[PDB]
Enzyme design. Structure first.
Site, PDB file in Angstrom:
ATOM      1  N   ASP A   1       0.841  -1.155   0.000  1.00 19.18           N
ATOM      2  CA  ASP A   1       0.000   0.000   0.000  1.00 19.18           C
ATOM      3  C   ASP A   1       0.889   1.221   0.000  1.00 19.18           C
ATOM      4  O   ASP A   1       1.824   1.358   0.851  1.00 19.18           O
ATOM      5  CB  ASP A   1      -0.870   0.034   1.331  1.00 19.18           C
TER       6      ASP A   1
ATOM      7  N   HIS B   1      -7.515   5.231   0.757  1.00 20.16           N
ATOM      8  CA  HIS B   1      -8.507   4.857   1.719  1.00 20.16           C
ATOM      9  C   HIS B   1      -7.891   4.746   3.085  1.00 20.16           C
ATOM     10  O   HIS B   1      -6.677   4.683   3.210  1.00 20.16           O
ATOM     11  CB  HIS B   1      -9.164   3.488   1.322  1.00 20.16           C
TER      12      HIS B   1
ATOM     13  N   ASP C   1      -7.262  -5.334   9.597  1.00 19.49           N
ATOM     14  CA  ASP C   1      -6.558  -4.091   9.718  1.00 19.49           C
ATOM     15  C   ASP C   1      -6.004  -3.893  11.090  1.00 19.49           C
ATOM     16  O   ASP C   1      -6.647  -3.179  11.890  1.00 19.49           O
ATOM     17  CB  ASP C   1      -7.412  -2.849   9.388  1.00 19.49           C
TER      18      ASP C   1
ATOM     19  N   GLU D   1     -10.955  -1.241  -2.824  1.00 21.13           N
ATOM     20  CA  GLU D   1     -11.857  -1.935  -3.743  1.00 21.13           C
ATOM     21  C   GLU D   1     -12.891  -1.025  -4.370  1.00 21.13           C
ATOM     22  O   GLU D   1     -13.433  -0.114  -3.726  1.00 21.13           O
ATOM     23  CB  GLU D   1     -12.558  -3.108  -3.009  1.00 21.13           C
TER      24      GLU D   1
ATOM     25  N   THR E   1     -10.446 -10.136  -5.458  1.00 18.94           N
ATOM     26  CA  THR E   1      -9.802 -10.262  -4.178  1.00 18.94           C
ATOM     27  C   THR E   1     -10.242 -11.437  -3.272  1.00 18.94           C
ATOM     28  O   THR E   1     -10.003 -11.374  -2.090  1.00 18.94           O
ATOM     29  CB  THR E   1      -9.770  -8.915  -3.422  1.00 18.94           C
TER      30      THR E   1
ATOM     31  N   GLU F   1      -6.581 -12.446  -5.267  1.00 19.78           N
ATOM     32  CA  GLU F   1      -5.940 -12.633  -3.971  1.00 19.78           C
ATOM     33  C   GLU F   1      -6.786 -13.564  -3.112  1.00 19.78           C
ATOM     34  O   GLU F   1      -7.975 -13.764  -3.353  1.00 19.78           O
ATOM     35  CB  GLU F   1      -5.827 -11.307  -3.183  1.00 19.78           C
ATOM     36  N   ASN F   2      -6.196 -14.104  -2.067  1.00  8.81           N
ATOM     37  CA  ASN F   2      -6.978 -14.807  -1.129  1.00  8.81           C
ATOM     38  C   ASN F   2      -7.532 -13.744  -0.233  1.00  8.81           C
ATOM     39  O   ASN F   2      -6.876 -12.707   0.012  1.00  8.81           O
ATOM     40  CB  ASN F   2      -6.176 -15.872  -0.310  1.00  8.81           C
ATOM     41  N   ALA F   3      -8.738 -13.977   0.293  1.00 10.00           N
ATOM     42  CA  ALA F   3      -9.370 -12.994   1.141  1.00 10.00           C
ATOM     43  C   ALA F   3      -8.959 -13.075   2.581  1.00 10.00           C
ATOM     44  O   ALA F   3      -8.882 -12.041   3.259  1.00 10.00           O
ATOM     45  CB  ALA F   3     -10.851 -13.098   1.063  1.00 10.00           C
ATOM     46  N   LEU F   4      -8.741 -14.287   3.084  1.00  5.66           N
ATOM     47  CA  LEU F   4      -8.407 -14.420   4.505  1.00  5.66           C
ATOM     48  C   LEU F   4      -7.174 -15.196   4.586  1.00  5.66           C
ATOM     49  O   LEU F   4      -6.876 -15.975   3.694  1.00  5.66           O
ATOM     50  CB  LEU F   4      -9.524 -15.178   5.286  1.00  5.66           C
TER      51      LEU F   4
END
Ligand SMILES: OC[C@H]1O[C@H](O[C@H]2[C@H](O)[C@@H](O)[C@@H](O[C@H]3[C@H](O)[C@@H](O)[C@@H](O[C@H]4[C@H](O)[C@@H](O)[C@H](O)O[C@@H]4CO)O[C@@H]3CO)O[C@@H]2CO)[C@H](O)[C@@H](O)[C@@H]1O
Length: 490
Positions: free
Chosen positions: A49, A89, A97, A182, A338, A376-379
């Site tokens: 980021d 964001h 986060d 997103e 994502t 991407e993997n989400a978790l």
């Protein structure tokens, strides 16, 4: 043709907060040792980021790029490529986060007196994590519009990182377009209560959006039409709402109108900002990319409530993703989906989740529009199950041992590089996942070998009218998927 043609690159996200809120690159030493492990595992690159809120903190056009320059340097020393997110964001209220990073204080200050710059729900709660699409073109930020702010930021990034860009370190630019970066509304804010299993709320209550809607219905001939008032709340289930139940609002002239208006605002939001990005990086050897969230909950009921809500007007008879993919085509951009890892069987039954079906729908749509698709993997996952799922999605039809595969994803960015990942047993597994993505080949430093050479970015193709985009709502049958990958981790 050669097996190498089956290679799908693997990137790893860096820790949130590797550069802190004070614009300090905290622990280069520590990161270094981690990166060195990834390079030895065969990882192609990493993702990071680039926080708007840290860079342009002090005041308008007051950028400080120094700590990010040190980071990029280290990454380059470690033999890795880089995917840079223009993160417009806040970091903080979303799942995972662990650090709070807000948008620039000076922007927050304006919001103190014009609360309508934030996404607002029906009760009047203001979400500070991202500026509402309603102000994209309002020249209220010390003379600038929100889009101008984003644009100036990406121009500055381009100029100040020109050396890294020209040295081929940065391979893609992910353009942040909403919460979590997103392109979607913040319909499921944990910061407001929302608990995973729930429908979410429409986020078009700020004054600008509300005025836009009111004018539009008037032009449609229905001035009396209002924003939804029977849609329920964050943790509702559809059947319990007037909007989403069968024969509910959402199948009414007014509901269709609203839903189309609401989803089109995103499309246009994304399209205009991509235009600015294309101009900022024009001539550079990067690809542009956007992120689309995977909202799998309620996918299996007719109303697709959580998807509508988030701004994806996707029903069983109206493809709400393909239009995004068509939009991305003029910009030659990549659709980064994502959520790749989940299996339908891992979801609680009452969520009516169809993660695997959602995936096949979104990828196919991209492939059908002839754009590049990544994900991407989400978790956070460390198991073979997860890995094999990602590998299946990467090459839905298996490997072609005598040519390029008929379908393949352009890349996958694994979720986060933590201590856990690096633990002995977990890392051994990851290594195999990397190998299998690579189609059993060793790491391949020159992406031209596997038909991923990056060319200088071209100017976008001409605007596609909303009507044309909306043709892509026509449902289509997905491409066929293997039941299992031919390249498993076990
Ligand atoms: O460093 C890069 C960004 O990382 C973080 O954002 C990433 C998300 O953490 C990651 O999940 C994903 O986004 C959405 C998922 O596609 C979507 O499935 C959903 O996740 C659900 C999940 O499916 C459900 O099972 C679970 O129990 O509830 C989840 C929702 O909370 O929502 C995800 C978020 O919208 O990719 C994101 C971007 O890379 C940081 O938050 C972000 O700030 C960073 O920029």
């Amino acid at each position: 043709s050669n097996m190498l043609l089956n290679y799908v690159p693997v990137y790893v996200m860096l820790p949130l907060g590797v550069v802190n809120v004070d614009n300090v690159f905290e622990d280069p030493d520590g990161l270094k040792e981690q990166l060195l492990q990834l390079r030895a595992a065969g990882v192609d690159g990493v993702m990071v980021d680039v926080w708007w809120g840290i860079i342009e903190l002090k005041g308008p056009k007051q950028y400080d790029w120094r700590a990010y320059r040190s980071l990029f340097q280290l990454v380059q020393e470690c033999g890795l490529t880089l995917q840079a997110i223009m993160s417009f964001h806040q970091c903080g209220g979303n799942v995972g986060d662990i650090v709070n990073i807000p948008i620039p204080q000076w922007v927050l200050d304006i919001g103190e007196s014009n609360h309508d710059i934030f996404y607002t729900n029906r009760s009047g709660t203001r979400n500070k994590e991202y500026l509402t699409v309603g102000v994209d073109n309002e020249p209220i930020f010390h003379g600038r519009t929100a889009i101008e702010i984003y644009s100036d930021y990406m121009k500055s990034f381009r100029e100040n990182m020109s050396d890294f860009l020209e040295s081929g370190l940065i391979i893609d630019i992910e353009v942040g377009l909403g919460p979590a970066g997103e392109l979607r509304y913040p319909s499921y804010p944990q910061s407001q209560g929302w608990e995973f299993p729930r429908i979410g709320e429409f986020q078009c209550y700020d004054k600008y959006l509300k005025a836009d809607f009111k004018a539009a219905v008037a032009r449609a001939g229905h001035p009396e039409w209002e924003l939804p008032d029977d849609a329920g709340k964050y943790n509702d289930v559809p059947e319990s709402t007037g909007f989403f139940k069968s024969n509910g609002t959402y199948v009414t002239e007014k509901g269709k109108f609203f839903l189309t208006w609401y989803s089109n605002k995103l499309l246009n939001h994304g399209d205009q900002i991509l235009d600015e990005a294309n101009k900022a990086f024009l001539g550079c050897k990067v690809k542009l990319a956007i992120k689309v969230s995977g909202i799998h909950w309620w996918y299996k009921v007719e109303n697709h409530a959580a998807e509508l809500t988030a701004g994806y007007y996707n029903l069983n008879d109206r493809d709400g993703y393909r239009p995004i993919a068509r939009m991305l085509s003029r910009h030659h951009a990549i659709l980064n989906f994502t959520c790749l890892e989940m299996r339908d069987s891992e979801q609680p039954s009452d969520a009516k989740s169809g993660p695997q079906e959602l995936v096949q729908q979104v990828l196919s749509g991209g492939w059908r529009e002839d754009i590049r698709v990544a994900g991407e993997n989400a978790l956070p996952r460390y198991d073979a199950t997860a890995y094999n799922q990602i590998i299946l999605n990467a090459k839905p039809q298996g490997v072609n041992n005598n040519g390029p595969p008929k379908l393949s994803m352009f890349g996958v960015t694994y979720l986060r590089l933590s201590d856990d990942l690096l633990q002995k047993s977990n890392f051994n597994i990851f290594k195999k996942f990397v190998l299998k993505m690579h189609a059993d080949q060793d790491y391949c430093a020159n992406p031209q070998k596997y038909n991923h050479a990056i060319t200088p970015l071209k100017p976008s193709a001409p605007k596609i009218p909303i009507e044309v985009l909306l043709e892509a709502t026509k449902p289509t049958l997905p491409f066929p998927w293997l039941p299992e990958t031919d390249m498993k981790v076990d």
